[PDB]
């Protein structure tokens, strides 16, 4: 734990990237989190929503 300050900065940046990548898996109230599924399943009036 001598070099904890640099490892702390690296871990914080990597964790922020991992959270940002993980946020794509959430649908945020939509039917699916995948854009291709929505574009292949729905007409543009509801796919727009």
């Amino acid at each position: 734990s001598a070099l904890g300050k640099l490892q702390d900065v690296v871990n914080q940046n990597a964790q922020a990237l991992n959270t940002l990548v993980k946020q794509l898996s959430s649908n945020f109230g939509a039917i699916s989190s995948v854009l291709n599924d929505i574009l292949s399943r729905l007409d543009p009036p509801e796919a727009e929503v």
């Binding site: 039917i31 292949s40 399943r41 729905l42 007409d43």
Partner: protein, 50 residues
């Protein structure tokens, strides 16, 4: 069947042409909710129930 004892039929291991369902004018109501009617020929499904 009656609505209290509605009949559930499993559909599996088949290729389905839904285009004959949209283009037929015999149905007064043809309303889809989680999928577009015209995209049904482009997708693959399982657990299909009538």
């Amino acid at each position: 069947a009656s609505v209290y004892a509605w009949n559930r039929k499993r559909i599996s291991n088949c290729v389905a042409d839904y285009s004959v369902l949209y283009n037929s004018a015999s149905f007064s109501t043809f309303k889809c909710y989680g999928v577009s009617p015209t995209k049904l020929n482009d997708l693959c499904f399982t657990n299909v129930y009538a």
